[PDB]
Amino acid sequence: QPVISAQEQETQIVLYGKLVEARQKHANKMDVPPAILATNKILVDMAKMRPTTVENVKRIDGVSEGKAAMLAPLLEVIKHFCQTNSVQTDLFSS
Ligand SMILES: [Cl-]
């Protein structure tokens, strides 16, 4: 019945919270509402699929090329978090 591990489930929740804060942080810097920078739905997808690149984050529903550039600090949060812990990134069919 379950598809992911209990640890994967934890990881996604923890990363999601880091992305929420990162979203609030940068959206402020850029003078955009956080939801305009990235919706919660986009943040969930980023927590599950964990892109670390502009090309990979463009593979997420709702992310354009120019939006990908705006989401760059969030990609940094992902790659660092996954490095510190020991978690696979870029879960795409590549
Ligand atoms: Cl969290």
Side-chain angles (χ1 to χ4, degrees):
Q1 186 91 57
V3 341
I4 56 167
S5 68
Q7 254 316 310
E8 168 65 17
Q9 185 173 84
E10 196 157 83
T11 290
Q12 284 183 13
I13 301 168
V14 167
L15 217 200
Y16 181 82
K18 296 180 174 304
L19 292 177
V20 163
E21 299 207 299
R23 178 181 62 182
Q24 189 71 245
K25 189 183 163 176
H26 205 244
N28 276 174
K29 283 177 76 158
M30 290 187 307
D31 189 41
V32 306
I36 293 297
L37 167 63
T39 180
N40 294 341
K41 180 186 150 268
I42 284 167
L43 253 39
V44 166
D45 283 342
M46 292 180 69
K48 295 190 175 194
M49 290 158 182
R50 265 112 65 188
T52 56
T53 66
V54 161
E55 298 295 349
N56 285 336
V57 79
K58 273 160 75 196
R59 295 169 85 180
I60 291 170
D61 319 57
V63 181
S64 71
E65 194 215 271
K67 199 179 192 70
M70 301 174 75
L71 289 167
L74 273 73
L75 264 29
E76 214 63 42
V77 166
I78 288 168
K79 66 175 97 165
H80 178 80
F81 173 89
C82 291
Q83 223 286 278
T84 308
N85 304 281
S86 290
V87 8
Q88 293 174 42
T89 69
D90 302 283
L91 284 57
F92 293 95
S93 76
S94 298

